[PDB]
Design a binder for this molecule. Structure first.
Ligand SMILES: [K+]
Ligand SMILES: [K+]
Ligand SMILES: [K+]
Ligand SMILES: [K+]
Ligand SMILES: [K+]
Ligand SMILES: [K+]
Ligand SMILES: [Mg+2]
Ligand SMILES: [Mg+2]
Ligand SMILES: [Mg+2]
Ligand SMILES: [Mg+2]
Ligand SMILES: [Mg+2]
Ligand SMILES: [Mg+2]
Ligand SMILES: [Mg+2]
Ligand SMILES: [Mg+2]
Ligand SMILES: [Mg+2]
Ligand SMILES: [Mg+2]
Ligand SMILES: [Mg+2]
Ligand SMILES: [Mg+2]
Ligand SMILES: [Mg+2]
Ligand SMILES: [Mg+2]
Ligand SMILES: [Mg+2]
Ligand SMILES: [Mg+2]
Ligand SMILES: [Mg+2]
Ligand SMILES: [Mg+2]
Ligand SMILES: [Mg+2]
Ligand SMILES: [Mg+2]
Ligand SMILES: [Mg+2]
Ligand SMILES: [Mg+2]
Ligand SMILES: [Mg+2]
Ligand SMILES: [Mg+2]
Ligand SMILES: [Mg+2]
Ligand SMILES: [Mg+2]
Ligand SMILES: [Mg+2]
Ligand SMILES: [Mg+2]
Ligand SMILES: [Mg+2]
Ligand SMILES: [Mg+2]
Ligand SMILES: [Mg+2]
Ligand SMILES: [Mg+2]
Ligand SMILES: [Mg+2]
Ligand SMILES: [Mg+2]
Ligand SMILES: [Mg+2]
Ligand SMILES: [Mg+2]
Ligand SMILES: [Mg+2]
Ligand SMILES: [Mg+2]
Lengths: 182, 260, 182, 72
RNA sequence: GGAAGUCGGCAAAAUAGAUGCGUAAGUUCGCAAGAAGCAUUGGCUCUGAGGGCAA
RNA sequence: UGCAUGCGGGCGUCCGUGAUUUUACUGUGACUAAAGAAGCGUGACUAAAGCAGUCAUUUGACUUGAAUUAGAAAGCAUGGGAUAACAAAGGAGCAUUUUUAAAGGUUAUUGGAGAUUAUGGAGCUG
RNA sequence: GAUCUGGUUGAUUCUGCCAGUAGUCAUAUGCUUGUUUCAAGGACUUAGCCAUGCAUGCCUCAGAAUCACUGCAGCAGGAAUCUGCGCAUGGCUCAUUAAAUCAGACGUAAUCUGCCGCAAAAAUCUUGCGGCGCAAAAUUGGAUAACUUGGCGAAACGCCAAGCUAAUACAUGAACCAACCGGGUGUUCUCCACGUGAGACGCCCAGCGAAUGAAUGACAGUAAAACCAAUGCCUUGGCAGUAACACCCAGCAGUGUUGACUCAAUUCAUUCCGUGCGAAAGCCGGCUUUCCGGCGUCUUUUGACGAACAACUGCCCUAUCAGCUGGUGAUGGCCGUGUAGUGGACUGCCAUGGCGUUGACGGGAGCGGGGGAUUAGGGUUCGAUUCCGGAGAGGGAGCCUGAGAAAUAGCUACCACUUCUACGGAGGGCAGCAGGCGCGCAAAUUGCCCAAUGUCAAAACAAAACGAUGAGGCAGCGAAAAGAAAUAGAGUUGUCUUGUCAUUUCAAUGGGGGAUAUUUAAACCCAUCCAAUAUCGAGUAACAAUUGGAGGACAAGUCUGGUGCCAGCACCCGCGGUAAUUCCAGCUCCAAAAGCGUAUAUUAA
């Protein structure tokens, strides 16, 4: 009562629950990017649908429309900043060509694996959730963290991590305590 | 009747966060309208940051440390409004409540010898007992012998000390004007013409410094000078010129990148 | 109690309004004064805003004006002789606004004598002559003054202000009520 | 409005005809409103005449307007 | 108290004038209907309304 | 406190007289509480959020930010007049100007103010 | 993502529904839940009934203390009580309600308006002493609480009598200092006249507000002269001028506002009772008829906060609802009454109006929006519920006080229900917060706190010295809903490039246990850490994921047992009568996943 903290959904279920083409394609993405559940794909689907819905509305307007100029600039700025689109493509029409792998390639889990800090995408997932990856000296434990292009060079092992410049992990520490007792 | 003011129902210009509380300080009756004022508690706490909460605001205000129009105001629900001079002599603060070009309250720092001067717009003229002419201003002042040339809509230049009128600015074409209501609140332009509609709202057509045309109702304008160059008051940073939204966004992005 | 609201009234369509609130103090009415001739009896009424209305139950004298002379005098009310609302108000000697009453004519005769020097200091003699020059008096008014009773119209509201002021009938209005009083 | 009835004393009924737009069907309806208007004896309007009416204080149960001008 | 009387409310009791509201099933639409019911009535002193004939 | 006063046309302000044109539509503009919906900016670890905050790193900057929108119909001002609407008429049911002179029949100005007069303007006819 | 699929036939092509499908801050129910963030939460049915407790009080330097109150030695603090303000806000709920309420847009010149802002104020023969005179910083009066005494009563948010004493309670009352202005007058007196005369002096009145009359509250389409009485001038007969005005004021309003006014305001006459008007006859501070400041109050006035009224356009279904209104108001008129004010709001009289198929009247379901869901678009649907508006406090009515109530943790009465009692009598109103009981498919703690947000108020905070607040906040409960996110990761060798299987080796991390601590009003969560000299912990990582399915729609078995048109499944088509792709099981597989089914509504389809 009298609480005005807003909240909204970030994903939707597919209209057809059992479509073999969609099931196989989503199984490919889950295995390829190490996703926990289909909800992560559907969250990406909603993000894309909102971006394309915005783009389609703007592309309807005349090219000199002030709203198209302002929001079209913002949409392109966001896509370039987060790495969804390359800097070569600057027209609003290229937002409509974005696909699910484009966003999934920008997740911290994929970026960590591609950067060589992890042997696999599954190794990357556990490294992130175990407080081993830092973006600009900030520990990030969210696999779905979308990495900006500017922050991509600042990804490394956390200074407080055993793999960075921190103390030894649990198994080494417990082994040392057992050795001291023994 | 009504003693409370829900924070959602409070004016948005007060910059009160919806999650901080259910209520807002309800302005008392006074110089300014409830919808067109800024209560002292908001000024001393949410804007000047001198008080961290309402308890400290009461400490400051009920001591008489805050002067409005050269008078100690001990009520945090006192409605301060447009052209009011706020002084805190112990900290050397002197502000005038103005509207920025976005229609929000701005605290314009005042020097000495100009915090003594307040511009008041004449809203009504009448005759009191003994056949004395009285001019009622936008801030509730009643002046018992104004300039004989004073008309409704004119601005009286007033000295808060000595309680004396010092000048009169008439509401005519070509005069500098600031808008105190509507979508154009805070903008400054010259009166190119006034469209008169008897029994209804008169329309004033204005032209800012850049040459852009805009219009408001005649009740929303406030004569502030002979011309745009000669203003009798000190205005905020934007000088009343509304920048293009797209141009403003690009400039802010460039400035942010420059600091980075 | 007594209500001045329109809720109980039929709509212009003849419909019965379904009242869905209780009676309010703001829409109240009160019983009439029914002021009658007699020794002055007055009852205050605390009205809205804390102000007082003077409900006159009985009145005997009043401040009556001679319009053509721009003067007034406090004279005694002799009888009420006509009432445009009902004959039963004349019969009960009820004083309301616009009812025709007979008032004492002695003060008006005295003022006329002392102002114009006419019965119905040499400087005052010249003053009388100057006042008479352009002055003319209606014969109907003068005839009534000689008789001792003049007809006047009540111009105040006794049930509101508690006083019965009035104005002497002159000209066409005097002839109108003289016809309706034979 | 246009004078509709002059049967009362010093009072007339005028009718204001207008088109109301129905959004769903993108079309209009013909609608009317009837007003009781006090008519001063300075005017002698007949049924079908167009008049200009101004808002005044409540003069009766239904009268809120006064005739200001008559156009034949 | 109120039909327990008696074959049976027989006999008696009861209702009543005028005026204003109001009046159900059914009906051949005419009625049913004075349906049923609910109110008011005196005396006195007044006030309105309802006309004729002349100039 | 005379301490005062001076070195032919077009405006804009208010009155008085003089034949009358709106509305729908469309473009601009006003006037329109928030919350909610779009949306700018912002690595609250991300996000749902929030309107915060950011940067120097000696006591403070950013004369910090919190932009903009949409919101039914109806009401308000103004521009356009194609398509339409409302009203009127029903066509004999109808309608010249300008010079001049002469004839007739309760205004300023006379130093105010109160009568009285006459003189002309100006209209009214011929 | 502007989408469809199964079932009518021996096959075909249609129409057409049934069924399937996705969402819902839509609820309920079942099964299952390791973290973490954010949240709805007795609306639906019974505006049903309620035990108990708490929800509105307020004191500064600055209204009134002689507590027979406490410290110090008159100074402080001061329980009670009178006085002043508030309790008409907030909170709750959605029963009533369709020319109503409400929304946007207007109006009140038809009105009221405490607290708050800016202002205004010259009426009002009072006091002391003496005997009308003399003087002046006005040294005013009577009560009543608390308290004491006696008490009454079973009690009662029940009472009586007597005795004390306060005021910013109540009442009374202030001359001169102290002005300007105007109207009546006198058989007053001085002058000029030979009276539209001029002066004084005397006398009645002349303040704000209110009442009734009378004026003003402007002008804004014609130029010239003559004569008469009064009168201004220049001059000693004229008309050059020229604000106005018979001094003491030679300019001390010839000029309010609006679109509009019978309004503002001014002048004249008369009136003003108690139902108006103190410099509260007030209280505190500093510097010392000492004068400076602070705030407190009466009255007048207009801004502000409001209140009340009016209504331009709009607002569901229903004709198996077609007429409605008008004794006793329906539509309009007149004079009144009443109101704060307009008004058929109401008395009297008058006239027949007024509304309705463009749906009146009646009936049905509904609080109204802002907004929610769903949505290519158009639409459909929900809105008891945070904000705004309205309305109510068991059901009706009525009312006092007050600026504001037709108030309900105010009063009065009746009805229903109900509590205490000593039988004579006295009480009650949770649709406030917790809690019960019922009702139901259906909805939490008789918790902590005023730390924040506000409200009230004699009030900044502090100092012997902490205002109240179930508004509100914080926790508990809470898979309504929303966000993030664990249940493992890297290899080794062997076996059957990748990929299975066994074992076999490394690290890592939380769930959890704790803390020098942090947070917090205090706690609790979340964050930080497992030495900084110095700090616990996974291998079956038993720290063990579920919910539905496997003929088709629709992803996934022609598997193995059992049953044998039985049991049962099956939203629909259908399966089951001994070799069941469908039941009951096992295994394996499929879908979603800390979630997944079911029912009922609703949107799409
Ligand atoms: K004290
Ligand atoms: K309406
Ligand atoms: K008057
Ligand atoms: K009337
Ligand atoms: K508090
Ligand atoms: K089998
Ligand atoms: Mg107006
Ligand atoms: Mg007679
Ligand atoms: Mg009987
Ligand atoms: Mg028998
Ligand atoms: Mg027998
Ligand atoms: Mg018989
Ligand atoms: Mg019948
Ligand atoms: Mg019968
Ligand atoms: Mg009968
Ligand atoms: Mg928002
Ligand atoms: Mg067939
Ligand atoms: Mg078949
Ligand atoms: Mg066959
Ligand atoms: Mg944890
Ligand atoms: Mg925990
Ligand atoms: Mg009291
Ligand atoms: Mg209340
Ligand atoms: Mg309330
Ligand atoms: Mg006085
Ligand atoms: Mg007044
Ligand atoms: Mg009829
Ligand atoms: Mg009236
Ligand atoms: Mg929602
Ligand atoms: Mg609602
Ligand atoms: Mg309900
Ligand atoms: Mg609730
Ligand atoms: Mg109520
Ligand atoms: Mg009540
Ligand atoms: Mg209660
Ligand atoms: Mg009750
Ligand atoms: Mg409760
Ligand atoms: Mg539940
Ligand atoms: Mg609460
Ligand atoms: Mg832990
Ligand atoms: Mg917490
Ligand atoms: Mg299949
Ligand atoms: Mg078998
Ligand atoms: Mg969960």
């Amino acid at each position: 009562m009298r609480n005005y903290n807003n909240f909204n959904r970030v994903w939707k279920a597919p209209r057809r629950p059992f479509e073999k083409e969609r099931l196989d394609r989503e199984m490919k993405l889950c295995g390829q990017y190490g996703l926990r559940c289909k909800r992560e794909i559907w969250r990406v689907n909603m993000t894309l649908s909102k971006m394309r819905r915005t783009a389609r509305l703007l592309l309807t307007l005349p090219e000199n429309h002030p709203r198209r100029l302002l929001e079209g600039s913002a949409i392109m700025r966001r896509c370039h900043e987060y790495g969804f689109l390359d800097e070569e493509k600057d027209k609003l029409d290229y937002v409509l060509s974005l696909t699910v792998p484009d966003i999934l390639e920008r997740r911290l889990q994929t970026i960590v694996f591609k950067a060589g800090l992890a042997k696999s995408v599954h190794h990357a997932r556990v490294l992130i959730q175990q407080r081993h990856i830092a973006v600009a000296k900030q520990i990030v434990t969210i696999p779905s963290f979308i990495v900006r292009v500017s922050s991509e060079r600042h990804i490394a092992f956390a200074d407080a991590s055993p793999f960075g410049n921190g103390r030894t992990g649990r198994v080494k520490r417990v082994r040392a305590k057992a050795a001291k007792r023994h | 009747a009504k003693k409370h003011l829900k924070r959602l129902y409070a004016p948005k210009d007060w910059m009160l966060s919806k999650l901080t509380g259910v209520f807002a300080p309800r302005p008392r009756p006074g110089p300014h309208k409830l919808r067109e004022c800024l209560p002292l508690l908001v000024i001393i706490r949410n804007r000047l940051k001198y008080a961290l909460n309402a308890r400290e605001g009461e400490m400051i205000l009920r001591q008489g440390l805050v002067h409005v129009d050269n008078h100690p105001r001990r009520d945090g629900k006192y409605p301060a409004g447009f052209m009011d001079v706020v002084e805190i002599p112990k900290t050397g603060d002197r502000f005038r409540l103005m509207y920025d070009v976005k229609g929000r309250f701005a605290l314009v720092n005042l020097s000495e010898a100009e915090a003594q001067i307040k511009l008041m717009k004449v809203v009504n003229l009448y005759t009191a007992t003994g056949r004395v002419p009285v001019a009622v201003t936008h801030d509730g002042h009643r002046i018992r012998y104004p300039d004989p040339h004073t008309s409704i809509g004119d601005t009286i230049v007033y000295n808060v000390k000595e309680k004396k009128c010092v000048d009169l600015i008439k509401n005519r074409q070509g005069k500098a004007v600031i808008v105190t209501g509507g979508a154009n609140r805070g903008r400054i332009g010259e009166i190119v013409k006034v469209e008169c509609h008897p029994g209804a709202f008169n329309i004033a057509h204005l032209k800012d410094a850049s040459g852009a045309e805009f219009a408001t109702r005649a009740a929303n304008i406030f004569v502030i000078g002979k011309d745009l160059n000669n203003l009798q008051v000190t205005v905020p940073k934007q000088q009343g010129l509304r920048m293009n939204v797209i141009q403003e966004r690009e400039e802010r992005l460039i400035a942010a990148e420059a600091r980075k | 109690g007594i209500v001045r609201s329109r809720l109980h009234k039929r709509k212009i369509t003849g419909g019965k309004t379904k009242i869905h609130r209780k009676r309010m103090k703001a829409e109240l009415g009160r019983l009439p004064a029914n002021t009658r001739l007699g020794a002055r009896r007055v009852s205050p009424v605390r009205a809205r805003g804390g102000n007082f209305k003077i409900r006159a139950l009985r009145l005997d004298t009043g401040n009556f004006a001679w319009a053509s002379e721009a003067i007034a005098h406090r004279v005694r009310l002799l009888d009420v002789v006509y009432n445009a609302t009902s004959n039963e108000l004349v019969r009960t000697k009820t004083l309301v606004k616009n009812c025709i009453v007979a008032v004492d004519a002695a003060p008006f005769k005295r003022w006329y004598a002392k102002h114009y020097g006419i019965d119905l200091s040499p400087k005052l003699q010249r003053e009388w002559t100057r006042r008479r020059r352009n002055h003319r008096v209606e014969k109907a008014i003068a005839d009534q003054l000689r008789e001792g009773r003049v007809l006047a119209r009540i111009t105040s509201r006794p049930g509101q202000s508690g006083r019965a002021d009035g104005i002497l009938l002159e000209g066409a209005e005097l002839q109108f009520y003289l016809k309706r009083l034979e | 409005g246009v004078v509709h009835s002059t049967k009362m004393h010093r009072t007339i009924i005028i009718r204001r005809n207008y088109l109301h737009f129905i959004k769903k069907y993108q079309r209009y309806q013909k609608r009317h409103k009837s007003l009781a208007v006090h008519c001063s004896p300075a005017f002698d309007p007949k049924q079908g005449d167009e008049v200009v009416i101004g808002q005044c204080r409540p003069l009766s149960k239904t009268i809120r307007y006064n005739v200001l001008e008559v156009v034949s």
